[PDB]
Each structure stands twice: as structure tokens, then as C-alpha cells.
Write an enzyme that holds these catalytic residues in place. Structure first.
Site, PDB file in Angstrom:
ATOM      1  N   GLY B 197       1.199  -1.304   0.151  1.00 14.05           N
ATOM      2  CA  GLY B 197       0.081  -0.083   0.056  1.00 14.05           C
ATOM      3  C   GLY B 197       1.181   1.335  -0.066  1.00 14.05           C
ATOM      4  O   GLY B 197       0.429   2.433   0.433  1.00 14.05           O
ATOM      5  N   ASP B 220       1.367  -1.759  -4.553  1.00 19.99           N
ATOM      6  CA  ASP B 220      -0.385  -0.475  -4.602  1.00 19.99           C
ATOM      7  C   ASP B 220      -0.990  -0.898  -5.816  1.00 19.99           C
ATOM      8  O   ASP B 220      -0.698  -1.787  -7.213  1.00 19.99           O
ATOM      9  CB  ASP B 220       0.024   0.527  -4.592  1.00 19.99           C
ATOM     10  CG  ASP B 220      -0.991   1.488  -3.636  1.00 19.99           C
ATOM     11  OD1 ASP B 220      -2.674   1.170  -3.606  1.00 19.99           O
ATOM     12  OD2 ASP B 220      -0.698   1.923  -2.514  1.00 19.99           O
ATOM     13  N   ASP B 240      -3.417  -6.785  -5.873  1.00 19.69           N
ATOM     14  CA  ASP B 240      -4.899  -6.375  -4.403  1.00 19.69           C
ATOM     15  C   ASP B 240      -3.799  -7.496  -2.975  1.00 19.69           C
ATOM     16  O   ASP B 240      -4.114  -8.576  -3.698  1.00 19.69           O
ATOM     17  CB  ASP B 240      -5.634  -7.348  -5.058  1.00 19.69           C
ATOM     18  CG  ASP B 240      -6.740  -7.170  -3.617  1.00 19.69           C
ATOM     19  OD1 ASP B 240      -6.277  -6.744  -2.535  1.00 19.69           O
ATOM     20  OD2 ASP B 240      -7.949  -7.417  -4.309  1.00 19.69           O
ATOM     21  N   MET B 241      -3.815  -6.318  -2.893  1.00 21.55           N
ATOM     22  CA  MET B 241      -2.336  -7.031  -1.346  1.00 21.55           C
ATOM     23  C   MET B 241      -4.023  -8.382  -0.840  1.00 21.55           C
ATOM     24  O   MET B 241      -2.980  -9.069   0.316  1.00 21.55           O
ATOM     25  CB  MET B 241      -2.707  -5.964  -0.292  1.00 21.55           C
ATOM     26  CG  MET B 241      -3.563  -5.557   0.201  1.00 21.55           C
ATOM     27  SD  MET B 241      -3.125  -3.790   1.652  1.00 21.55           S
ATOM     28  CE  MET B 241      -5.094  -2.927   2.487  1.00 21.55           C
ATOM     29  N   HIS B 258      -5.425   0.840   9.331  1.00 23.91           N
ATOM     30  CA  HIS B 258      -6.353   2.103  10.018  1.00 23.91           C
ATOM     31  C   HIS B 258      -7.512   2.107   8.763  1.00 23.91           C
ATOM     32  O   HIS B 258      -8.537   2.595   8.986  1.00 23.91           O
ATOM     33  CB  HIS B 258      -6.133   3.453  10.687  1.00 23.91           C
ATOM     34  CG  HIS B 258      -5.856   4.034   9.899  1.00 23.91           C
ATOM     35  ND1 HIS B 258      -5.652   5.889   9.643  1.00 23.91           N
ATOM     36  CD2 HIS B 258      -5.029   4.766   8.281  1.00 23.91           C
ATOM     37  CE1 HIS B 258      -5.640   6.463   8.969  1.00 23.91           C
ATOM     38  NE2 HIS B 258      -5.113   5.061   7.443  1.00 23.91           N
ATOM     39  N   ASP B 259      -6.943   1.947   7.362  1.00 22.48           N
ATOM     40  CA  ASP B 259      -8.832   2.082   6.515  1.00 22.48           C
ATOM     41  C   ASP B 259      -9.019   0.241   6.152  1.00 22.48           C
ATOM     42  O   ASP B 259     -10.252   0.249   6.364  1.00 22.48           O
ATOM     43  CB  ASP B 259      -7.955   1.689   5.385  1.00 22.48           C
ATOM     44  CG  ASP B 259      -7.091   2.831   4.673  1.00 22.48           C
ATOM     45  OD1 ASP B 259      -7.202   4.192   5.221  1.00 22.48           O
ATOM     46  OD2 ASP B 259      -5.969   2.226   4.363  1.00 22.48           O
ATOM     47  N   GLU B 286       1.471   3.693  11.930  1.00 21.33           N
ATOM     48  CA  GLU B 286       0.021   3.827  12.474  1.00 21.33           C
ATOM     49  C   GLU B 286       0.608   5.075  14.232  1.00 21.33           C
ATOM     50  O   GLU B 286       1.448   4.720  14.562  1.00 21.33           O
ATOM     51  CB  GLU B 286      -1.028   2.741  12.922  1.00 21.33           C
ATOM     52  CG  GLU B 286      -1.063   2.293  12.080  1.00 21.33           C
ATOM     53  CD  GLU B 286      -1.792   2.396  10.510  1.00 21.33           C
ATOM     54  OE1 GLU B 286      -2.140   3.477  10.488  1.00 21.33           O
ATOM     55  OE2 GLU B 286      -2.004   1.651   9.504  1.00 21.33           O
ATOM     56  N   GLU B 318      -8.195   3.366  14.378  1.00 26.46           N
ATOM     57  CA  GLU B 318      -7.441   3.973  14.765  1.00 26.46           C
ATOM     58  C   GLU B 318      -8.012   2.940  16.222  1.00 26.46           C
ATOM     59  O   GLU B 318      -8.805   2.661  16.522  1.00 26.46           O
ATOM     60  CB  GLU B 318      -7.495   5.635  15.235  1.00 26.46           C
ATOM     61  CG  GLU B 318      -6.901   6.487  14.053  1.00 26.46           C
ATOM     62  CD  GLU B 318      -6.636   5.920  13.557  1.00 26.46           C
ATOM     63  OE1 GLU B 318      -4.944   5.466  13.723  1.00 26.46           O
ATOM     64  OE2 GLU B 318      -6.707   6.307  12.233  1.00 26.46           O
TER      65      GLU B 318
END
Ligand SMILES: Nc1ncnc2c1ncn2[C@@H]1O[C@H](CSCC[C@H](N)C(=O)O)[C@@H](O)[C@H]1O
Ligand SMILES: Nc1ncnc2c1ncn2[C@@H]1O[C@H](CSCC[C@H](N)C(=O)O)[C@@H](O)[C@H]1O
Ligand SMILES: COc1cc(/C=C/CO)ccc1O
Ligand SMILES: COc1cc(/C=C\CO)ccc1O
Lengths: 361, 354
Positions: B197, B220, B240-241, B258-259, B286, B318
Site C-alpha cells: 500500500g 499498490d 491486491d494485497m 487503519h483503513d 500508524e 484507530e
């Protein structure tokens, strides 16, 4: 004036303030959602003995069956709490995980209905409406090109637009009515300048909330509420108030005094002068204009009271044809330039000063 | 009741709080802060009229309109001010740079947080906020309610906002990673790093700049990778991870966990575990959620970002340090190290062996 030497430490704070600024809209947008969900009123009505309520206990009272509503609410409320919009308390869970419970903070008195059924919440919903966000995308254009951000976004001025969009007209008129009810109730407890009048005209008086209040307190006064026809159309028919539609730049109804609250701040100096000459003409020799406006502080100091004025100045820049906030000397100069011989600052409530422009000193 | 007065005024401040970022956006779009930065010394001041003289405008109201925007900024200490009396006895303001302006104008390396602000305030990212009430009552994600697809699929369809987003992230990450790379030694000795990413590749490029013999892979989605500048020693790769990630000695993930939901994080983390040698690591960069809704700027940045993730991301949020530990444990890692911090961003290592 002690000089702060730049360091790692000060850079950390500067960088993080930049990031806070970048995402600052999350605050008013999260607060708008909380108010549309009726969260603060739920909190006000069901705060257990302790005065703190869990997000699950809030969500229980919403029209939802979404199992994520409690965690989503907790996240919103956590944001609000960091800004002192709500308060919090922490309690330890079986897991040793810690949960937050939330309570009302002092500001919530003005974001939930008082005993008169009124608050600033409708004012917040106005200021955060999608309609009134759109001009902000055209502010740089207005600085470069001239003109008004709102008019760049909508092809017309704000009032004409409210004349075409019934939803936002109603949101606007109600935001103003509720805000003005709170301010004017306090003004009327202290200011005696309506006494002895037989006629008052509230020019740009909206749906007539203020006019109604003045006659409720002084039943011997003849009150005229004057505004644009699309506002008058669905003004409540308050007893003792005559609603009249028109355009104040053409002229205004005759009275012993003319009241203008948050009218001057909507218009350039040139427009105000035209309005204030029309006022002078509609008054008897001894009459006055009663002007209710914020007054610009001497400096851009960090106080909340100052910031409200300055925020409002930025709203006027976004929305209105030349509207702006003004200092006391600026208001005095408008009075003098429209022929008035006397000027005084008579009263104040919630930042709103009451000034008298006197035909005779 | 000055007590009622202050509560009423606070309410009004809240109500119109969007004026501040949106006013700041316009000053940035106008190049105002850059004008200021080049036109007077670090401790000096400049009039609105002198700023406006550097804009390509003939609007006779440009100076006063800038004065009014700058006054807003000044009230929040975004810019500094000084007062100058006029012959009329009115006062006018001259304005200068406050410390925060150092992060809203280009630094030595040509970056700042300005593009991140332009991202956060773009009409595209503002619109999901009108669907927050709906997501809370009905379920789902405010962004998807507005646009009908997840944010990443949307960015593969809107080239303009793709660039805005990638640039926001690239410039923010450049600032942060420059500071981390001064303090953190965990890339040292690696043969291969993979930035999963990694966006348009700013962080990979900085790693290889510091350690020129490291082989870096910037991984990414393909609409991101197509815009990644070439950088010697960085291989840009699309994919695509969730299907798998590139192999390397260490995997770096900044602002990835965090996404996503905890479940999605596990899936990702297990893919990373499988892509590493036996004694490899994932380097997780993060924020860390503080233990209470305290009023600090630092905590507010984290909580505002928790709110952004609410609006935009499927399950993103978070987390606390203990939550990250639980993520590492549940994806098979056996050691956990908090190695470094810069601008709220903590650098954690999830170690396959302890
Ligand atoms: N040309 C005009 N003639 C009369 N009223 C006008 C006008 N243009 C704008 N207005 C009105 O001016 C008002 C400004 S908002 C303030 C409303 C009210 N006095 C209050 O303080 O709550 C609106 O009601 C708007 O419709
Ligand atoms: N399934 C997937 N595979 C690979 N990358 C993904 C992905 N879903 C999202 N992304 C990428 O995850 C990144 C999250 S934003 C963070 C970018 C970068 N690490 C930085 O901190 O600056 C984006 O670049 C986005 O395109
Ligand atoms: C959609 O994912 C992200 C969004 C933001 C912020 C967007 C608007 O400010 C920041 C980091 C992310 O990883
Ligand atoms: C367009 O005229 C006005 C607008 C506002 C705007 C938003 C407040 O929610 C406030 C006062 C006014 O007189």
C-alpha cells in the site's frame, strides 16, 4: 513576546496543528449528525441517576436495528468529547477494556430545547447544510474575479435562491428564528428602548419571531414584520403583528422606530447607506433605527466571543452581497452618512449589541 | 450569567466551525502562504494589499477579502498579526507566518501538508459526511452511500481525486518518514523491503535514498502504481494485497491497518507473515489511540482520523497499542516492538520470532 526557538518539540506541535486544520470539518459535520439523530436530546432525557449514558443505551433509543450503531456513536461522541461538546467518564470492562460513557457538557444547554422549546441546534443545521457548504468551493474565485462565492455556486444571490428552494428557505428561516428568540429574550429583559413607541417595524424581520416578542411584551405597540414575499408567505400569523412583503431597498414601512437585526451585516456599505436612508425617510422627526449586530473587536484575539464575530464575518464573505462585520466607529459612520444625528450603544446579549441611530440628538 | 453567555457563544462557534478549514483551503489555493513566505523575513509581516499585488487579479476588493480571510486565520494563530493605525483612526492588520505555516508551505524537499489539506477539504471527501446519520441508522459506510462503491474503486474511476489523494498521502508521508528515518534503524541490513500500500512510492524512494543497496518494492493498486514516479532502486508493482503480497525481508505498512476492520487486518497480516522469511518482520506505521478524549492537538488528530475512517472506509478505525499487539498475535507474530514515533505516527515491528 518571549521568542520560541524552533525545535523538534515545537515542530511536532506545528505539524500536528496543520493536520488538525486539514480535517477540521469533521467536528461540525459529526455534530450535525449527532443533532439530526437526536442524540443530545436523548442524552438530556435519559441520563441515568449518574448523568452518564453509554453509546449502546443511546442507540437503544434510536430508530435503528443496526448492530454497529453503538460503536459508531461512541466514535462520534469521542470526537465531540475531545472538544468539550459532551463530557465523558471511563469504566473498566470485564475484559479490562475500558468503555466510555457520555454526559452533557455546558454547551449542550444551547444545543437542546430549553423551556421555550428553543435552541441553537436549528442554527447549526443551517450552517452545516450542504447548500451553504457549496459556496466555500468558490471563495478563491471571488477573491480573484470579484463577486460573491454564493452567486458563483448558484447563478443568483442567496435570497433569490432561497425563493426557489423551499427546503433551505425553511431551514434558514427557522435557524434565524430560534437564534433570534434566544438573543431577543435576553435583550428585552435589559433594553428599554421599545417603551413608549406606538409603532415598530422589523425590517428584514424574517418569519416575525422578534416582532411577536416585542408585542407580547408591549401590547400597546403596532408591530409590522417586513421581509421578502417568499419569507412572509409562511410566517406564522402572530397576533399583533402585521406581515408585509417588499424589498427594503425600494423603501420601508413607516413606524416610530425601525428594528434591523442582522440586516446591515448582510450588505455592503453602499447598500446599507441606501437602506438607512430609506429608514430615515420612514421615521418621524424624533424616530430612531434600532440596529442589533455584532461589533468587531479591536484585534483578531483568540477568545471565543471574538472568533464568533470573525467566523460570522467569513460567513458574510461567502454568502452575501458585500456583507461584513463592522466596528462601533464603522456603524457610527453609517448612521452619520444616512443623516442620523445621534448614535449610542444601548445594550448587549450573546455578542449582539443593540445600537440606536437617532434622527435627533 | 457570563456562564450562559459563554455556552451560547461556544455553540455559535461550533455551528460555523467549517469556515476555518475552508478559508484556509482558499488561502492555500491562492498561494497566499507561499507569497507570505517568500515576501518578508521569517519574523516579518505583510499587508493584504501587498499579498494581493502578487495575485493575477484586478479585483479592487481583493485586498480586503484577503484581509478578512487572514483575520480568521490570525484568530486561530494560523498566521501572526500586527496592527497598524490608519490616518482615519481605523486600524489595519499586517500578517506573518506562524510555526504551522512551515508545514503548509513547501519545505527544503518541496513538500508540505498543503496537499493533504486540499484532499481533506475536497468536495468529493466532504460529501460522505451528509450520509453519516444514514449509515448509523441503516448500516453501511457513508462514502459508499454517496458513491455506490468503496473508496478505492472510486479512486480507480476518478482520475482527478486519485491524484489529489495520492499527492496528499505522498507529501504527508515524505515529512513523516524523513523524521522517522533520522531515528529508526530497523531498515538497516535488509536486502529487500516491500511497501504494501505504498501509494506513489515516496517512502520506498526515501528508504533506497538512505540505503542505496536495498532492493525496494512499492506495491499498490494499479491505478495508483500507474502514477508513481520512477525512482532508481524502486520496483513499482500493481496488485491486491488481499490476494497476496510481494516477498521481502521486511514488509512496511503505513496507514494501511487503519483503513480496515480487524478481520481484514488479520487477512492482510497473515499474507504478510507468509511473504516473509522465518525471522522477518512487518513494520507497522500508524497512530495510537490515546486512552481518553483529551483536548490535546495530538489526540485530536488521532480522533479526527478515527472519524475520517468512519466516514470513508469499510471497518477502518484507530487502535491502541494493545489492539495492535492483539492483531500481531492473532496473525502469528511472536514479538512486538515499539521502535520509534514521528508526528503521531508510531513505528511498531511485528516480529515473526522473539
Ligand atoms: N431586499 C430585502 N428586503 C427585505 N428583507 C430582506 C431583503 N433581502 C434580504 N432580506 C431579509 O433579511 C433577513 C436577513 S437574516 C436576519 C433575519 C432576522 N432579522 C433575524 O435576526 O433573525 C432575511 O429574513 C431576508 O429574507
Ligand atoms: N487491496 C489493496 N491492495 C494494495 N493496496 C491497497 C489496497 N486497498 C487500498 N490500497 C492502498 O492503500 C493505501 C492507503 S493510504 C496510505 C498510503 C501510504 N502507505 C502512505 O502512508 O502515504 C492507498 O495507496 C491505497 O491505494
Ligand atoms: C481512505 O483512507 C485514508 C483517508 C485519509 C484521509 C482522507 C481525507 O483526509 C487518510 C488516510 C487514509 O489511509
Ligand atoms: C445570508 O445571511 C445570513 C447568513 C448566516 C449564515 C449561516 C448561519 O447559520 C447568518 C446570518 C445572516 O444574516
Amino acid at each position: 513576546e518571549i521568542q520560541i526557538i524552533p525545535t523538534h518539540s515545537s515542530d511536532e506541535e506545528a505539524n500536528l496543528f496543520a493536520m488538525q486544520l486539514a480535517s477540521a470539518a469533521v467536528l461540525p459535520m459529526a455534530l450535525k449528525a449527532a443533532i439530526e439523530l437526536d442524540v443530545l436530546e436523548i442524552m438530556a432525557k435519559s441520563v441515568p441517576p449518574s448523568g452518564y449514558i453509554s453509546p449502546a443505551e443511546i442507540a437503544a433509543q434510536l430508530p435503528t436495528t443496526n448492530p454497529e450503531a453503538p460503536v459508531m456513536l461512541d466514535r462520534v461522541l469521542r470526537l465531540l468529547a475531545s472538544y468539550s461538546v459532551v463530557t465523558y467518564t471511563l469504566r473498566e470492562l470485564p475484559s479490562g477494556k475500558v468503555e466510555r460513557l457520555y454526559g452533557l457538557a455546558p454547551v449542550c444547554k444551547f444545543l437542546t430545547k430549553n423551556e421555550d422549546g428553543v435552541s441553537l441546534a436549528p442554527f447549526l443545521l443551517l450552517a452545516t447544510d450542504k447548500v451553504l457548504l457549496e459556496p466555500w468551493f468558490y471563495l478563491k474565485d471571488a477573491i480573484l474575479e470579484g463577486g460573491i462565492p454564493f452567486n458563483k455556486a448558484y447563478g443568483m444571490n442567496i435570497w433569490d435562491y432561497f425563493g426557489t428552494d423551499h427546503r433551505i428557505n425553511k431551514v434558514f428561516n427557522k435557524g434565524m428564528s430560534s437564534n433570534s428568540t434566544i438573543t431577543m429574550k435576553k435583550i428585552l429583559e435589559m433594553y428599554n428602548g421599545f417603551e413608549g413607541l406606538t409603532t415598530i417595524v422589523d425590517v428584514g424581520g424574517g418569519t416575525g419571531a422578534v416582532a411577536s416578542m416585542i408585542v407580547a411584551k408591549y401590547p400597546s405597540i403596532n408591530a409590522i414584520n417586513f421581509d421578502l414575499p417568499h419569507v412572509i408567505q409562511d410566517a406564522p400569523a402572530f397576533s399583533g403583528v402585521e406581515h408585509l412583503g417588499g424589498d427594503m431597498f425600494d423603501g420601508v414601512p413607516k413606524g416610530d422606530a425601525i428594528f434591523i437585526k442582522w440586516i446591515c451585516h448582510d450588505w455592503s456599505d453602499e447598500h446599507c447607506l441606501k437602506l438607512l436612508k430609506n429608514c430615515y425617510a420612514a421615521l418621524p422627526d424624533h424616530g430612531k433605527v434600532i440596529v442589533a449586530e455584532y461589533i468587531l473587536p479591536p484585534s483578531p484575539d483568540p477568545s471565543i466571543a471574538t472568533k464568533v464575530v470573525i467566523h460570522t464575518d467569513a460567513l458574510m464573505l461567502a454568502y452575501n452581497p458585500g456583507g461584513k462585520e463592522r466596528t462601533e466607529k464603522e456603524f457610527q459612520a453609517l448612521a452619520m452618512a444616512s443623516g442620523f444625528r445621534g448614535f449610542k450603544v444601548a445594550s448587549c446579549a450573546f455578542n449582539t449589541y443593540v445600537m440606536e441611530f437617532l434622527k435627533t440628538a
